[PDB]
Amino acid sequence: QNTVSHVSAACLFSEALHGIPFGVKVLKALAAANVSDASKAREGCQDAVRRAEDAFSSTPKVEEAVGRARAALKEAESAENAAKTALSDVEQYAANAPLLAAGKTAPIDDYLKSVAEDNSAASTARRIARGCSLPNRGVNSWVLKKAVEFGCEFFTGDICKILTDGMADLRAEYDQLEAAVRRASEARVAARAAESNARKAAEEAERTAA
C-alpha cells in the first residue's frame, strides 16, 4: 500500500497532525482578542450610561434614553461574561487537542519513512514521502475530515476502520475548540451591538438636553 495516492493521503494526515500545535495557538489568540474587544464594548456602554445620566440631570425628557443605555449595558455585561466563559472553554480544548494529535504522528511518520527508504517503491511515492515535513499551519476540522476521508479512500477497510475509530476523539475535541472560538466571536459581536445601542441612546439624550 505504497502507491502515490497512499503516500499523498498519509502525508496530508501527518502534516495536518503536526500543524495542530500551530493552529491551536492562533485560535487561542483569536478568542483572547475577542474577550478584550468585548470588555472594551462594555466599557463603552458604561460611558454611554454616564453620558445619558448627565443629560438627564439637565432634562427629564431623556429619561427613556437613560433606560435604553442601562439595558444595553446589561446586555454588554452578559456578552462580555459569555466571551470570557468561551475563552475558558477554548483554553481547555486547546490544551486537550494537541495531546491527542502528538500521539498519532509516530505511526504515520513511520509509514512515510518506510516508503521513503523502500527501493521497491515508485519514484514519486518516495519523493512525496521523503519531502513530507511541512506542518500544515492551516489545519482545522475540515482538513482533519479530509485526511480521514483520503485514508479511507485509498487504504484497505481494516486501516480505514482503525483510522476512523482512532481519530474520533481528536476530531471531537477540535470540533469543540472551533465551536468555543465561534462562541467567543459571537459574544464579542453581541457586546459591540449593545454598545452601538448604548451610544445611540447617549447621543439622543445629549441632543435632547441641548
Q: How far apart are CA 184 and CA 125, in angstroms?
A: 43
> Experimentally, how was this structure solved?
X-ray
Q: H/E/C letters for each residue in the chain?
A: CCCHHHHHHHHHHHHHHHHHHHHHHHHHHHHHHHHHHHHHHHHHHHHHHHHHHHHHHHCHHHHHHHHHHHHHHHHHHHHHHHHHHHHHHHHHHHHHHHHHHHCCHHHHHHHHHHHHCCCCCCHHHHHHHHCCCCCCCCCCHHHHHHHHHHHHHHCCHHHHHHHHHHHHHHHHHHHHHHHHHHHHHHHHHHHHHHHHHHHHHHHHHHHHHC
Grid coordinates in use for 191?
A: 457586546
CA dist 189 and 210 (Å) reads 32
**155 neighbors 9 (Cβ within 8 angstroms):** yes
Q: What are the Cα distances from residue 154, in Å, to 55, 101, 119, 121?
A: 71, 22, 21, 16
Residue bearing cell 475548540:
177
Handedness of CA 39, 42, 48, 49 (dihedral sign): negative
Cα separation, 150 vs 159, whole angstroms: 11
Give residues with Cβ within 8 angstroms of 62, minimum separation 6.
52, 55, 56, 204, 205, 208, 209
Query: What are the φ and ψ backbone dihedral angles of 127, each rounded to 5 degrees?
Result: -65, -45
Cell of 3: 502507491
- Quick one: resolution in A? 1.8
